[PDB]
UniProtKB/TrEMBL annotation, chain A:
Residues of the full protein shown: 282 to 352 of 562
Compartments where found: Mitochondrion inner membrane
Protein name: ATP synthase subunit alpha
Segment forming the signal sequence: none
Positions annotated to bind Mg(2+) 2: 44
Function field: Mitochondrial membrane ATP synthase (F(1)F(0) ATP synthase or Complex V) produces ATP from ADP in the presence of a proton gradient across the membrane which is generated by electron transport complexes of the respiratory chain. F-type ATPases consist of two structural domains, F(1) - containing the extramembraneous catalytic core, and F(0) - containing the membrane proton channel, linked together by a central stalk and a peripheral stalk. During catalysis, ATP synthesis in the catalytic domain of F(1) is coupled via a rotary mechanism of the central stalk subunits to proton translocation.
Family: Belongs to the ATPase alpha/beta chains family.
Automatic annotation (TrEMBL), chain B:
Residue positions binding ATP 1: 348-349, 352
Compartments, as annotated in UniProt: Mitochondrion inner membrane
GO annotations of cellular component type: mitochondrial inner membrane; proton-transporting ATP synthase complex
Positions of Mg(2+) 1 binding: 154, 179-180, 183, 249
Catalysed reactions, as listed in the record: ATP + H2O + 4 H(+)(in) = ADP + phosphate + 5 H(+)(out)
Gene Ontology biological process terms in this record: proton motive force-driven mitochondrial ATP synthesis
EC numbers for this chain: 7.1.2.2
Superkingdom, natural source: Eukaryota
Positions that bind ADP: 150-155, 180, 338, 417
The gene coding this protein: atp2
Subunit structure: F-type ATPases have 2 components, CF(1) - the catalytic core - and CF(0) - the membrane proton channel. CF(1) and CF(0) have multiple subunits. F-type ATPases have 2 components, CF(1) - the catalytic core - and CF(0) - the membrane proton channel. CF(1) has five subunits: alpha(3), beta(3), gamma(1), delta(1), epsilon(1). CF(0) has three main subunits: a, b and c.
The entry's keywords: ATP synthesis, ATP-binding, CF(1), Hydrogen ion transport, Hydrolase, Ion transport, Membrane, Metal-binding, Nucleotide-binding, Translocase, Transport
Name this protein carries in UniProt: ATP synthase subunit beta
Matches recorded under InterPro entries: AAA+_ATPase, ATP-synt_VA_C, ATP_synth_F1_bsu, ATPase_a/bsu_AS, ATPase_alpha/beta_chains, ATPase_F1/V1/A1_a/bsu_N, ATPase_F1/V1/A1_a/bsu_N_sf, ATPase_F1/V1/A1_a/bsu_nucl-bd
Length: 71, 538
């Protein structure tokens, strides 16, 4: 933990908050990339992010594509 | 003159109180962190057009001013774009200044009309032996490239760029449609070292324009970046009058991006899930790649087959346009054969004797027969034995193995890191060189004499040198020198070899750091627009 950040958008969190957590974890990890150091980002279940984003899009009545996912 | 009405993801509706822009016109959003270009997709009614954005729409406000450019996306074309990297809307992303535009052309264009078409059908000579014999390239054709990683696809791309520029005098455009930026940077830097892209004052001696739409670009930007590659190649065809190569890197990602912009525009998806306009989204692009009376565009476009399913509608619609396939294989690549064109899997529509002639046709038809009969007996050799079968079946094995070697060729763009010079092999020298191996004028020569050579005048000059080599191995001798204390130290003497590595307990983690104080109060904007704390009760 002296080298690790943990961004945690768990199951009870809102689907907007699980959609934005890989992006907000990446921005925290992009700090080390942009200042010359090296980063290791792990998006554990990126397939669970896309399910959270499909939830927001079908509820915003955006037109669904394959497996009801957005364009 | 128009203002932003709706922002739904990458799809912007803007509203014009005057005259509407035409469909496919380009709109620029006034006042935004990046230059945002919208392309008009439809006229919705009630003075609204629906647009697909070429960049991110985050930070876009309803009522933002939107200027109609009066035209589609206009990109710089000409010789000044050679050796430059350009994005979909024509901006330089290679960080080398502005693009010297000979003209600025609309990227939307009808295909050349029926009278402008060439009724003739002829070979684009490539200087690659396995491509000019077994799967010839039609001038003005579309060629599917079934490569991958490590089969030498990029050095085959740069060799097509090299030989078409050197022999036929035509330039190349590389349209990278939805490419990874790590791989698009790899192609840029390998084109710089191999000489097909030059930087600086000798920029004009470059042979290839790179038109890049990366994966992180929105689906509208990737769907139009192959038409930006068309438009650069159409200037060389119609104004310069050249035989242009166009590389649409992954034509499947063109399909995939156009399928996303139909899904975002609310269109009902077709069979398996592509856009309803799949055959006219492809056919609009593929029909501008043709031969006119001025010059030609030949397209070598990489084909991905989804789920290894050739009957999927994205390859099946693509293969209706394709005039040749070049399949690059790993099995051919691990035999040291470069280029790794599979001599049996690679097909051409140009390979029939009414268009290449019967003396070319029977050579390629005979060469493929020899290689086919050799590779269906490879569960006869390993099961039974090599010297088991007949002498004629061994005559094919000796003839096929020095044909399978002779399809190799050293490349002129690869010589800066391989040492072996490049060999442009002419068409008549390819046919006449393979007549002889087919009949048996070279059955006495070794198989590795037929390896990485130009033509049959160089197979004799390789068997001469290797055969003599046995005359020049009695020059010196070969045994052991000073078993393991010649210059092999002790292991504890090698621990004191090791150089100083300074390890800091400090991380150096506050180099140039702002360290803003963030307060956990909720800050909102009141009705003046003034930043204020959030009011207390609902």
């Amino acid at each position: 933990m002296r080298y690790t950040i943990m961004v945690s958008a768990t199951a009870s969190d809102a689907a907007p908050l699980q959609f934005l957590a890989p992006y907000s974890g990446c921005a925290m990890a992009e700090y080390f990339r942009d200042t010359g150091k090296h980063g290791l980002i792990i998006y554990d279940d990126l397939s669970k992010q896309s399910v959270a984003y499909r939830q927001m899009s079908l509820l915003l009545r955006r037109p669904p594509g394959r497996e009801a996912f957005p364009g | 003159a128009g203002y932003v009405s709706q922002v739904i993801g990458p799809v912007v509706d803007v509203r014009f109180d005057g005259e509407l822009p035409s469909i496919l016109s380009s709109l620029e959003v006034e006042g935004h962190s990046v230059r945002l270009v919208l392309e008009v997709a439809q006229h919705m009614g009630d003075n609204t057009v629906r647009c697909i954005a070429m960049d991110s729409t985050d930070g876009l406000v309803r009522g933002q001013k939107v200027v109609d450019t009066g035209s589609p996306i206009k990109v710089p074309v000409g010789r000044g774009t050679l050796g430059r990297i350009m994005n979909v809307i024509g901006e330089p992303v290679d960080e080398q200044g502005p693009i010297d535009a000979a003209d600025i052309w609309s990227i939307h264009r009808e295909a050349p009309e029926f009278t402008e078409q060439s009724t003739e059908q002829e070979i684009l000579v490539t200087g690659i032996k396995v491509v000019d014999l077994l799967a010839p390239y039609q001038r003005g054709g579309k060629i599917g490239l079934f490569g991958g990683a490590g089969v030498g696809k990029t050095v085959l791309i740069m060799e097509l760029i090299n030989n078409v520029a050197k022999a036929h005098g035509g330039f190349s455009v590389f349209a990278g449609v939805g490419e990874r930026t790590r791989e698009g940077n790899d192609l840029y830097r390998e084109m710089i070292e191999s000489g097909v892209i030059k930087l600086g004052a000798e920029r004009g001696n470059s042979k290839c324009t790179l038109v890049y739409g990366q994966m992180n670009e929105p689906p509208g930007a990737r769907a139009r970046v192959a038409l930006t590659g068309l438009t650069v190649a159409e200037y060389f065809r119609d104004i310069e009058g050249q035989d242009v190569l166009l590389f649409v890197d992954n034509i499947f990602r063109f399909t995939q991006a156009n399928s996303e912009v139909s899904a975002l525009l609310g269109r009902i998806p077709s069979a398996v899930g592509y856009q309803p306009t799949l055959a006219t989204d492809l056919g609009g692009l593929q029909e501008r790649i043709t031969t006119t009376t001025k010059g030609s565009i030949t397209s070598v476009q990489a084909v991905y087959v989804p789920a290894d399913d050739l009957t999927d509608p994205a390859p099946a619609t693509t293969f209706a346009h394709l005039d040749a396939t070049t399949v690059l294989s790993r099995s051919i690549a691990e035999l040291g054969i470069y280029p790794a064109v599979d001599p049996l899997d690679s097909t051409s529509r140009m390979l029939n004797p009414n268009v290449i002639g019967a003396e070319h046709y029977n050579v390629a038809r005979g060469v493929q027969k020899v290689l086919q009969d050799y590779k269906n007996l490879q569960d006869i050799i390993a099961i039974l034995g090599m010297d088991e079968l007949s002498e004629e079946d061994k005559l094919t094995v000796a003839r096929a193995r020095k044909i399978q070697r002779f399809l190799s060729q050293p490349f002129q763009v690869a010589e800066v890191f391989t040492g072996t010079p490049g060999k442009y092999v002419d068409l008549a020298d390819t046919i006449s060189g393979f007549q002889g191996v087919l009949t048996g004028k070279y059955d006495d020569l070794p198989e590795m004499a037929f390896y990485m050579v130009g033509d049959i005048k160089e197979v004799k000059e390789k068997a001469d040198k290797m055969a003599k080599d046995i005359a020049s191995r009695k020059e010196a001798d070969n045994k052991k020198v000073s078993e393991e204390l010649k210059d092999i130290p002790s292991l504890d003497k090698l621990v004191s070899e090791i150089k100083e590595v300074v390890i800091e307990e400090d991380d150096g983690l506050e180099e140039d750091f702002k360290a803003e104080a963030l307060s956990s109060e909720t800050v909102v904007l009141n009705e003046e627009g003034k930043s204020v704390p959030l009011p207390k009760k609902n």
